[PDB]
């Protein structure tokens, strides 16, 4: 069962991946939250067209198990949010990795910090929402993360 994370003008679903069996109820669940864009980081298994037809732009942006995001994925992630909250005020960004508690929330926590949340607070906020979040490796990257932007 999926997780909302609101902070200010920003809005995030952390999800699980569907099967093709669940795909309709998955897409309907996305539509319920009013999403414009999925990012798949993991479980890149199912037909994306039925989701993209319903309005929901799907990006396979895969990186590694237990890893911080590659810098290029960061910049695409940052740019995606920056427009999509400005272009459609209100709307949500969906992510899933494999149980939604490693690299998927890293991308979220990334965003929060870039929105000028303190590192620790960003982290705690996520962990409040989903307990277990981040390995030590990713926590570090978060800590070491200086925002610009």
């Amino acid at each position: 069962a999926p997780v909302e994370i609101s902070y200010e003008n920003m809005r995030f679903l952390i999800t699980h991946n569907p099967t093709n069996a669940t795909l309709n109820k998955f897409t309907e669940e996305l539509k319920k939250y009013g999403v414009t864009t999925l990012v798949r980081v993991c479980d890149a298994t199912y037909d994306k067209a039925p989701v993209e037809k319903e309005g929901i732009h799907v990006l396979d942006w895969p990186f590694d198990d237990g890893a911080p995001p590659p810098n290029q994925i960061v910049d695409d992630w940052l740019n995606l949010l920056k427009t999509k909250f400005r272009e459609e005020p209100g709307c949500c960004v969906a992510v899933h990795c494999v149980a939604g508690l490693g690299r998927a929330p890293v991308l979220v926590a990334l965003a929060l910090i870039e929105c000028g949340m303190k590192y620790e607070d960003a982290v705690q906020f996520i962990r409040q929402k989903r307990r277990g979040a981040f390995n030590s490796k990713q926590l570090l990257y978060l800590e070491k993360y200086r925002p610009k932007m």
Partner: protein, 135 residues
């Protein structure tokens, strides 16, 4: 006291596979257990997708043999997740906030260079929690 002491570990749980057929001898095997609540796994036992209540089975007969996997899509019972370290009073809230008087028991996992996960440990019901409260 955490869930963990009161937890039934997974091997010792009665459960059923997701492509169970409910024939005579299966429906009996459900009954002869006498749990109110029977979990539904796929196909690794730690992976639990759905949740047979009793009153589910009331409205089947073993005609023809009827799939389990249908019945569970029918009522679409939510399944309730608990952490291992949840202290017993805190668990008791979750049963009271839920309809449900069973939760499946998740331990976290930061062991491994991977992403975290929830390990699945086993099961804890209302009855067990009270059966500990008395002791």
């Amino acid at each position: 006291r955490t869930v963990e002491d009161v937890l039934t570990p997974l091997e010792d749980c009665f459960m059923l596979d997701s492509g169970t057929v409910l024939d005579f001898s299966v429906l009996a095997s459900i009954m002869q257990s006498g749990h109110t609540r029977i979990p539904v796994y796929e196909e690794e036992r730690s992976n639990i997708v759905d949740m047979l209540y009793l009153k589910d089975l009331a409205i089947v007969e073993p005609e023809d043999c009827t799939p389990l996997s249908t019945i569970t899509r029918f009522y679409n019972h939510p399944l309730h997740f608990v952490f291992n370290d949840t202290k017993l009073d805190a668990v008791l809230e979750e049963f009271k906030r839920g309809k449900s008087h069973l939760a499946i028991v998740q331990k976290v996992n930061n062991e491994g260079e991977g992403d975290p996960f929830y390990e699945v440990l086993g099961l804890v019901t209302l009855e067990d929690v009270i059966e500990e409260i008395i002791k």
